[PDB]
């Protein structure tokens, strides 16, 4: 419906600057019934953007997971140690593919063969700008060995069962493994 010409970003006021940033967006935007809004302000968490890799072995039908503590999970989770996808922050001028492949090697010792885009998503766009771009990457699960990080090699079915049971419940891994559950048959044919 509406485009960026229908929004006026008046200011971005730094509320906090540390490792991450918190900015106050001051803006006006067009209304569905006509006209422009008044001035609106929103606190937005700015932490850059990330690349995500689902390491999938199409020959063996196995996924490689990585385990590490995420203290932000503490208050609402059984444990702050999460089972996650390979992922890393994207710095200026870097590509999703470069970051994804680099992180797979350094976080899991995985050489990546072919890749395909899965999806790129906004983690929580009401309060943060963060975008994460997911690839699926062809890996040899027998070469996975491995910031304190532990590598897990599991069947695809087990990984998806853990999504269903809530044992895997971070957005990137849920999105990637749900996508795999929807596409693994065609993906295994294509990569075999």
Ligand X SMILES: Nc1ncnc2c1ncn2[C@H]1C[C@H](O)[C@@H](COP(=O)(O)OP(=O)(O)OP(=O)(O)O)O1
Which positions make up the binding site for AMP? 43, 70, 126
Packing angle of the helix pair 156-165, 171-191 (nearest 10 deg): 150
131-160 residues near its own copies, rule: CB under 8 A? 131-132, 148-150, 152-154, 158
Which CB, 133 or 137, lies closer to its own copies?
133
Binding residues: 43, 70, 87, 103, 107, 126, 147
**In the structure encoding, which two tokens stand for residue 78, read together?**
């059984």
Identify whether the C-beta of residue 50 lies closer than 8 Å to the C-beta of residue 133.
yes
88 forms part of the interface with ligand X (CB under 6 A): yes
Within 151-190, the residues that bind ligand X by CB under 6 A are none
Signed CA dihedral, 102, 153, 70, 147: sign only: negative
d(CA 59, CA 83): 22
Q: Minimum Å distance from CB 93 to Mg ion?
A: 18
Buried b (16+ CB within 10 A) or exposed e, 173-189: bbbbbebbeeebeebbe
For β-strands 49-57 and 131-138, DSSP reports them as: parallel
45: left (phi over 0), alpha (psi -120 to 50) or beta: beta
* Residue 47 vs 60, nearer CB to ligand X: 47
19 counts as binding ligand X under rule CB under 6 A: yes
Residues in binding contact with ligand X, number by CB under 6 A:
13
Under the binding rule (CB under 8 A), the answer on residue 74 touching its own copies is yes
Instruction: Tell me which DSSP letter residue 143 carries.
Output: G
Least Å distance, CB 1 to ligand X, is 17
* Residue 75's binding partner out of Mg ion, ligand X, its own copies, none, with CB under 5 to 8 Å set by partner kind: its own copies
The whole-angstrom separation of Cα 89 and Cα 15 is 22
The correct pick among 22, 60, 106, 115 for binding its own copies (CB under 8 A) is 22
User: x/- string (CB under 6 A) for ligand X, residues 108-147?
Assistant: ------------------xx-------------------x
DSSP state of 91: P
Q: Which of residues 20-59 bind ligand X (CB under 6 A)?
A: 42-44, 50
Give me the residues that bind ligand X (CB under 6 A), please.
Answer: 19, 42-44, 50, 87-89, 103, 107, 126-127, 147
């Amino acid at each position: 419906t509406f485009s960026k010409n229908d929004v006026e970003i008046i200011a971005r006021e730094t509320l906090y600057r540390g490792f991450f940033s918190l900015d106050l967006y001051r803006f006006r935007h067009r209304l569905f019934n006509g006209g422009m809004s008044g001035e609106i302000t929103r606190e937005i968490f700015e932490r850059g953007h990330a690349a995500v890799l689902l390491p999938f072995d199409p020959v063996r039908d196995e996924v490689v997971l990585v385990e590490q503590i995420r203290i932000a999970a503490y208050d609402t989770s059984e444990s702050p140690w999460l089972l996650e996808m390979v992922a890393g922050m994207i710095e200026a001028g870097e590509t999703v593919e470069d970051v994804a492949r680099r992180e797979a090697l350094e976080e899991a010792g995985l050489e990546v063969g072919r890749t395909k885009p899965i999806l790129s998503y906004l983690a929580s766009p009401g309060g943060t700008s963060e975008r994460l771009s997911i690839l699926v990457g062809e890996v040899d699960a027998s070469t996975a060995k491995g910031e304190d990080i532990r590598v897990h090699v599991v069947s695809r079915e087990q990984a998806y069962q853990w999504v269903e049971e809530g044992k895997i419940d971070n957005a990137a891994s849920v999105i990637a493994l749900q996508w795999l559950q929807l596409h693994y048959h065609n993906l295994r044919n294509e990569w075999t």
